[PDB]
Symmetry: D2
Subunit: 159 residues, 4 copies
């Protein structure tokens, strides 16, 4: 389950796919990670790989799907968390991504790598709140400048 | 309380101030609404007027203060609500202003005036959420374009 | 391309899938829309259907991918726009969804249906800005209440 | 300008006010900082003090006005920047306040005090973006849970 035969042929197709991947032929790499998945539908690495192949051809919905599956299959396959983080950044969901970089930083406490990624990301989350504030600042200046104070009137009636 | 004498002189100074106001001499209009206030410290109209005099010389903190006082004194002096709305727009607190335009629209249901102001304002509240979204959209496009997918790696280890 | 033979068998598998779909067997419906896609990889309806099958089993990344493909294949297959809108709502990207409901409302101007969907959506976009404002209001009240004004000091030095 | 006489009496009234301030009698402290201001209208400390007296009685618009004036009069009277920061926090304009705490931190680089205030504030700016995100997260969960996927339909027409 699969027979040792589906397991061995799935491992060949995966290699075939890798070749195609390293040679920039994504269409074929995706085609072959898929066959390997048909035969060994529970191998997290295949999904991790195909997810990346999907990130390289800008298919962010597919990559996210493949990334979540990898994590459903092996809760402790780190790259699944990197593939999902990458898919969510591409989809613009930066805080969802930060959640995954955090997870990795927690299990690889001294991996300078994890730290770097999570930093880049927390940064991008803060620059977003930044660009938004400025725009709100820029807009306020324009409203205030356009305020019709001149047409306002003093109470010209007894008091 | 005040003596009929403080009441009558307060009404003269108020007029003196109005003159100065209509003649664009804000420094003096403020000087005289103040004297009228010293003598009749509970007249809402004086505060309403001085608030406006403060909006005309860009003193938004003073105008807001004078506007809140007018409303503390006569809960149903409409202009106090317009002075406070105007002060909060200038201070960039658009939703606080909208709250006041709403109040006026509720008591003057058919005053096309109230409707117009409240419309301008709800609009400015929506344009703000707009400019902010765009900026967030613009920033996302730039993050996604800069995402280092190329340095990501396929699992090059047995699986 | 495909041979009339792949075209006819793809249309059977699609039906097989539909059966499985209407009988709530999503795992099998997905399995069969896929075979139909292997044989007729350019049929937008198959993708539209599989996308929905993906929305029903909560696989929002896959559904979005299948929805974008349907739109790449037939720019004027409306449901593709509904599948993509639905996938983006589920993914929390409400404004991206609104963009698609708008497109449909523009080509089906009198379809009360299009209007209804786009209304639900513009509403959800406005309720989001709402819940966010309140939370910001609630937080401000708490900061202001906690402000240490009492420890502030008057200038106790000559002036 | 003023005559040495207005200068000396203004300094007495200021003291009178301080007494009233330290004895929690704000109404009178405000009354006397005002007289001192009438006689020496250009003394920044009087404004700084009255601003605080205004923060203590919750008159945030007046305090902000008095704080800006103090800064117009003596660009390097630090407390003016603390009074304005305090008025803007109370008014909910946290980032405007942060701007002032930054200014002070820049001229008093080693004043642990400046650092502490600016920290409290940058924190409050970040907790606000926080409470807002959560609310947006909470709302998304509810939309997604309410999404009518069940009424969606597979294409039941030839393809």
């Amino acid at each position: 389950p699969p027979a040792d035969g589906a397991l061995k042929r799935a491992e060949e197709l995966k290699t075939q796919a890798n070749d195609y991947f390293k040679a920039k032929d994504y269409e074929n790499a995706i085609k072959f990670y898929s066959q390997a998945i048909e035969l060994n539908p529970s191998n997290a690495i295949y999904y991790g790989n195909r997810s990346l192949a999907y990130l390289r051809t800008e298919c962010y919905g597919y990559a996210l799907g493949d990334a979540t599956r990898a994590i459903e299959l092996d809760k402790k396959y780190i790259k699944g968390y990197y593939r999902r983080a990458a898919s969510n950044m591409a989809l613009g969901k930066f805080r969802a991504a930060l959640r995954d970089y955090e997870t990795v930083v927690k299990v690889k406490p001294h991996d300078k790598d994890a730290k770097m990624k999570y930093q880049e990301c927390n940064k991008i989350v803060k620059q977003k709140a930044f660009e938004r504030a400025i725009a709100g600042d820029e807009h306020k200046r324009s409203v205030v400048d356009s305020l019709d104070i001149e047409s306002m009137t003093i109470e010209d009636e007894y008091s």
